Amino acid sequence: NAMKAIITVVGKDKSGIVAGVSGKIAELGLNIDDISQTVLDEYFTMMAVVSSDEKQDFTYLRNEFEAFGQTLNVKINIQSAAIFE
Amino acid sequence: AMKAIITVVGKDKSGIVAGVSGKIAELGLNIDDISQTVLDEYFTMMAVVSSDEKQDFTYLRNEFEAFGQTLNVKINIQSAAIFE
Amino acid sequence: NAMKAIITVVGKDKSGIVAGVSGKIAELGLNIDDISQTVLDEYFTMMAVVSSDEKQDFTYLRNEFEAFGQTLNVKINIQSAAIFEAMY
Numbered sequence: 001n002a003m004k005a006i007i008t009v010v011g012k013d014k015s016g017i018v019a020g021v022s023g024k025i026a027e028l029g030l031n032i033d034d035i036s037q038t039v040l041d042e043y044f045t046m047m048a049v050v051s052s053d054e055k056q057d058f059t060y061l062r063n064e065f066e067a068f069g070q071t072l073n074v075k076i077n078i079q080s081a082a083i084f085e
Numbered sequence: 086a087m088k089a090i091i092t093v094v095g096k097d098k099s100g101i102v103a104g105v106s107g108k109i110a111e112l113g114l115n116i117d118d119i120s121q122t123v124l125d126e127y128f129t130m131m132a133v134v135s136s137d138e139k140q141d142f143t144y145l146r147n148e149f150e151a152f153g154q155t156l157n158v159k160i161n162i163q164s165a166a167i168f169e
Numbered sequence: 170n171a172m173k174a175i176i177t178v179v180g181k182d183k184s185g186i187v188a189g190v191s192g193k194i195a196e197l198g199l200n201i202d203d204i205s206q207t208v209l210d211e212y213f214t215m216m217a218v219v220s221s222d223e224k225q226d227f228t229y230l231r232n233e234f235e236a237f238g239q240t241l242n243v244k245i246n247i248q249s250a251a252i253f254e255a256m257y
């Protein structure tokens with residue numbers, strides 16, 4: 001990997017979220033290394049670890065996921081894995 | 086238009102989620118839902134996939150089977166029709 | 170209740186994390202309505218939905234959770250549930 005990141009998705013409705021977010025990840029040419037989804041209280045929640053063999057622009061990715069999350073009524077965060085290693 | 090269940094079984098999950106979800110996307114299929122478990126000496130995953138276009142299950146079964154061999158896992162794809 | 174939030178945690182190692190984070194939530198006088206944890210690739214992750222019957226200050230909580238997170242080498246995010254409910 002040149003890039004790795006953890007993506008967090010929080011919303012109220014689960015409907016179509018896994019398809020939307022996985023499709024977006026794929027649109028951006030990122031690999032899904034792992035994924036998990038959990039209903040928690042009244043919320044549907046989803047986390048994915050993603051990567052690419054090329055350096056990416058987190059400024060762009062963060063804004064792009066944020067804007068995409070908004071279209072689906074969910075909050076999306078992306079964190080570079082560089083924080084841990 | 087198309088809906089299916091993909092089941093994956095192998096001994097080691099290293100790289101399996103990326104490989105299989107990557108193959109799914111290469112084939113233009115949507116991942117509607119996904120789950121994984123470690124089971125005995127095995128890792129398993131399942132995904133429900135779909136497309137707005139008709140698909141050829143004959144081709145897909147063969148393609149996922151061949152792809153599975155490259156990763157040392159067994160991949161089945163079954164149409165949603167069969168779980169009727 | 171008057172406050173509800175979703176807390177998310179990411180780090181490399183699970184050792185001590187559940188105890189540290191649940192312990193911090195109780196110190197802050199917050200209720201855990203629900204919780205879940207998973208290993209995800211090489212990371213330990215947990216998520217919790219918390220609430221209080223008193224209004225809270227998310228400016229303070231965000232800072233406090235991030236600061237506490239650092240003591241445990243984990244990234245802690247908190248999001249008010251109001252964002253998913255409120256009209257505009």
Ligand SMILES: [K+]
Binds near residue numbers: 069070073074252
């Ligand atoms: K939102």
